[PDB]
Amino acid sequence: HMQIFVKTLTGKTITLEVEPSDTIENVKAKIQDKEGIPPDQQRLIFAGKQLEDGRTLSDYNIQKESTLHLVLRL
Amino acid sequence: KTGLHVHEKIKHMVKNYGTMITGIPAEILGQNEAEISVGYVKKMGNMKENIAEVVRKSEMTQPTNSAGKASNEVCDLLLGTEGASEFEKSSYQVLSGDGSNLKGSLPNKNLLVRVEMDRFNAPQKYQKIKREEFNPETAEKNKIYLLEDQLVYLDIFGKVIDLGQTSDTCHRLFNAITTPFYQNYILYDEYIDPEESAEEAAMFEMGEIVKAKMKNIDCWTATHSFTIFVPESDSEDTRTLYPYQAYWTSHTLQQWFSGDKDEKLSRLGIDGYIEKLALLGTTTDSKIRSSIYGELFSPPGKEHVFCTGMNEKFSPLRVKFKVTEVNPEIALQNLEEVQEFIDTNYPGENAKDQCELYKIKAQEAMTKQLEMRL
Amino acid sequence: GLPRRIIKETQRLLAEPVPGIKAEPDESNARYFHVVIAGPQDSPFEGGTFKLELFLPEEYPMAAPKVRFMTKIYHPNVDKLGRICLDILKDKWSPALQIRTVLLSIQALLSAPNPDDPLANDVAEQWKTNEAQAIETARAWTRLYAMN
């Protein structure tokens, strides 16, 4: 349905294909598939606010071509 | 002794340089940290002296404590970007009960193992609901849902998974649970007695139904990642392994190497380590699991409090491994390229002043970005 | 409308409370525990008695119980309000954990602070920086707010 980008402090940009219905944990599973990082360690930031594991993408008003940030420290 | 030089080289470089072994210029770290951390600046007043405090507060140059990122950096350095990418394509193998397949996957060559450890993220909650009431996108995830004609599991992705129960059984269990508090409760309450009342019998039967059905539903999500370097040895009774790891919100690979926990766990021997690693996945005792988890994966010194009280490991764990070969010359060449990058772009008479110069470059780049934006 | 888990937890906690931790409920709202933890030995908080409130949500034991230090205490893991920054209370709470484990972790954190990935402010930076005067300012906070 929709393409989103996930950037990290290392400068790496990865591109996921998701839907607004997709849960945050599903995005974390896709990041695991593409980068081998366990979901229990990923912090996803959109507009400066953490994305919580029970919620979905449409809960955070995340739509097409949006850019998230993968925090990997604390 | 050449694979041993590889181990010594990567340990020394990580210990002395932290995040600089990633080969990423400090300017990039500063700029991206400025782009992520602009909303945290105080919007009023002399903000240049107010962005000074946000630059000072930054920990952008501190090495990651994400265990997956640490494993990725280790694989990069030991296999080049190419061999690392090809190792990504290999499939994990679930560890056996005795861990024998792992020890059989360890011939006497320079080897790299990558281990991914999963929690069993089974649902711990249940709730009565009517089919009209049920919308999977908005409903709570990883939750059992009892209906008058169906018993379903809403998984972590939002997929409704039927539990093979008839409308008769489901109607009986649905109507037997009357108490208003038990309409949205937990699945396995120790303080529930099935023979005390019909409602508690219903809750116990539903709990055991779900407990049996989950036994073949993939509730595994990844919780830890680490690597193991097993160099070639003169014998087979002197060969040893060295686990490399960070831990989320606990320690960096730098701290792991500083406390020499790689050497401490190397003293266990190959079989000594593999036996504990397998038992971690096979055991049912919560505190046996907790003590082995703390022995293997804690920062040095905190082995006995890492998984106690509230961090007790109650979920069943599963260990998965992949093995590939390490050409010591490729690893040494990658480490030498990183060392020359660091010595050329961040000079100094010792690695410590070089780390500080790297930090200052990163802070200045972050300052310039935050200034040119506000 | 109190689940038998709450009342049997209370009965087993009155039948077995933690040494140094005294938890007993009040009657206007039985979800309320006036818990009191004295400062463990060999700690900067020793000799003092810190009063905390423990509130059971109606969503307990699906939701974690709120715990707040009423007394002020110089510690790199409780804030000015007294909100204990155990990660139990927000994410990593599970019904396998009970009130006794929460109180156990609070007491252990009183005996072993963590100021390296913490929540406190200048308390945390001064604890990692200068453990001595951090311990000693905690001692003074104890002698001021926790002795009476």
Residue numbers in the entry:
A (entry chain D): 0 to 73
B (entry chain A): 8 to 381
C (entry chain B): 3 to 150
Quote the study on this structure:
To understand the mechanism underlying MavC-catalyzed non-canonical ubiquitination, we cocrystallized MavC, UBE2N, and Ub, and solved the crystal structure of the MavCC74A/UBE2N/Ub ternary complex at a resolution of 2.93 Å. Following the nomenclature of the study of Valleau et al. 24, MavC comprises of a main domain, which is further divided into head and tail regions, and an insertion domain (residues 128–226). The insertion domain of MavC contributes to interaction with UBE2N, which also interacts with the head region of the main domain of MavC simultaneously. Different from other Cif effectors which bind Ub with only the head and tail regions, the insertion domain of MavC also interacts with Ub apart from the main domain. The MavC–Ub binding buries 2580.7 Å2 surface area, including four contacting regions. The deamidation site Q40 is also contained in this contact region, which may play an essential role in the presentation of Q40 to the catalytic center of MavC. The sidechain of Q40 also forms hydrogen bonds with the amide nitrogen atom of C74 (A74 here in the structure) and the sidechain hydroxyl of MavCS73. In the ternary complex structure, the density for the last three residues of Ub (R74-G76) are lacking, suggesting that they are not involved in the interaction with MavC. The MavC–UBE2N binding buries 2300.6 Å2 surface area, including three contacting regions, namely contact A2–C2. Interestingly, in structure of the ternary complex, no marked conformational change was observed for the K92-containing loop region of UBE2N.
Recently, two L. pneumophila effectors MavC and MvcA, were identified as structural homologs of cycle inhibiting factor (Cif) effectors. MavC catalyzes the transglutamination reaction between Ub and UBE2N, leading to UBE2N ubiquitination in an unconventional form. Non-canonical ubiquitination of UBE2N by MavC abolishes its activity in the formation of K63-type polyubiquitin chains, which dampens NF-κB signaling in the initial phase of L. pneumophila infection. Here, we report the structures of the MavC/UBE2N/Ub ternary complex, MavC/UBE2N–Ub (product) binary complex, and MavC/Lpg2149 binary complex, which provide important insights into the mechanism and inhibition of this transglutaminase-induced ubiquitination by MavC.
